[PDB]
């Protein structure tokens, strides 16, 4: 992890970056700011190179799609809650997601979104906007409090709330027992594995493959070629992590390094290339009158 640049937010006393992700065009980070404004920069120079106001609160989340044309954000105490914007010619909002917490693109082609809403979990068409399905079963809640609906690489699989889903059925196929209170899991992008705080469990078999003790209270990130895996912990204003960040290798889960980065951290993503790891850390403590972020960017 050699640090290649670093950068603040422009025009800002105080730096207010909360969380980012590469664009669809390389050399340009996109962040989300406690301002709730997107911001396009070039991650070298640290040039701002646009801005747009998506939400009157923080930005807790964003997804650009593959193809550049869409976006996806969520924030934090905002009606809408998260929403769907266009990036072809002009920015402009699409469709919005009026109480889910947090959203993502499917994966295999990207025409759905699916939302979460604290247990519930909401499958949305790109193009109509409708709410296409609810998944949630109160018998089989896991109840976390970091709950996070997501597709798995095919599209036809949901893991809510510990529970693994049948998108096509419908069906809650099963329930994956609870064995930490915030953590709710994560698809290998190799389809076969689900990794679930520190337990990695086989998809055909349900047997547990893995403990990974060192992935407790980790949100996990993959690189783009799948070998690589990120996590922060959860911290035990407020940042949602602490100040380090793991990786494995995501073939056999053995340990590559641990870096505490002193600063606690708001956010990690790498590029499509993974040639970089761009980590948002704070300068100020929790206790600052104002949040003050860096963006920096490590080569692996
Ligand atoms: C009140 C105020 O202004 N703030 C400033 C901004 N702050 C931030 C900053 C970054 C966040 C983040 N980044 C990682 C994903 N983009 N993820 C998230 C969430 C999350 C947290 C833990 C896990 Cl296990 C999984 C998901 C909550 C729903 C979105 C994902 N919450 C965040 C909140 C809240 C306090
Ligand atoms: C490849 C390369 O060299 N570049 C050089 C610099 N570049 C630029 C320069 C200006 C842009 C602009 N106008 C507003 C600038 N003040 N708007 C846009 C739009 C946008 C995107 C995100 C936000 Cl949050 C706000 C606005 C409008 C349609 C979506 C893109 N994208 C821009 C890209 C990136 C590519
Ligand atoms: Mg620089």
Not at 233 to 249: D, V
Request: net charge negative.
């Amino acid at each position: 992890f050699r640090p290649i640049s670093v950068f603040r937010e422009a025009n800002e006393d105080e730096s207010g970056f909360t969380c980012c992700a590469f664009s669809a065009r390389e050399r340009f980070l996109m962040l989300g700011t406690c301002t709730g404004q997107l911001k396009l920069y070039n991650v070298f120079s640290g040039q701002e190179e646009a801005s747009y106001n998506c939400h009157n609160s923080a930005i807790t989340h964003l997804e650009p799609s593959r193809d550049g044309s869409l976006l996806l954000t969520s924030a934090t105490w905002s009606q809408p809650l998260s929403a769907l914007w266009g990036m072809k010619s002009v920015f402009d909002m699409k469709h919005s997601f009026t109480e889910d917490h947090y959203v993502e693109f499917s994966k295999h082609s990207q025409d759905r979104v699916i939302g979460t809403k604290g247990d519930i979990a909401h499958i949305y068409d790109i193009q109509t906007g409708n709410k296409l399905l609810t998944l949630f079963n109160p018998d089989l809640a896991n109840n976390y409090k970091r709950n996070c609906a997501t597709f798995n690489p095919t599209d036809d699989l949901v893991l809510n709330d510990g529970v693994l889903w049948d998108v096509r059925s419908a069906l809650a196929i099963h329930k994956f027992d609870k064995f930490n209170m915030n953590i709710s899991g994560v698809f290998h992008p190799n389809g076969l594995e689900v990794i679930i705080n520190t337990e990695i469990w086989d998809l055909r078999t349900f047997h547990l493959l893995h403990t990974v003790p060192a992935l407790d209270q980790c949100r996990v990130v993959f690189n783009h070629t799948g070998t690589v895996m990120y996590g922060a912990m959860l911290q035990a204003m407020k940042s949602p992590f602490g100040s380090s960040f793991r990786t494995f290798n995501a073939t056999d889960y053995k340990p590559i390094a641990t870096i505490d980065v002193k600063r606690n951290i708001f956010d990690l993503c790498t590029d499509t290339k993974d040639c970089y790891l761009a980590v948002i850390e704070n300068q100020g403590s929790m206790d600052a009158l104002n949040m003050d972020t860096v963006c920096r960017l490590y080569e692996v």
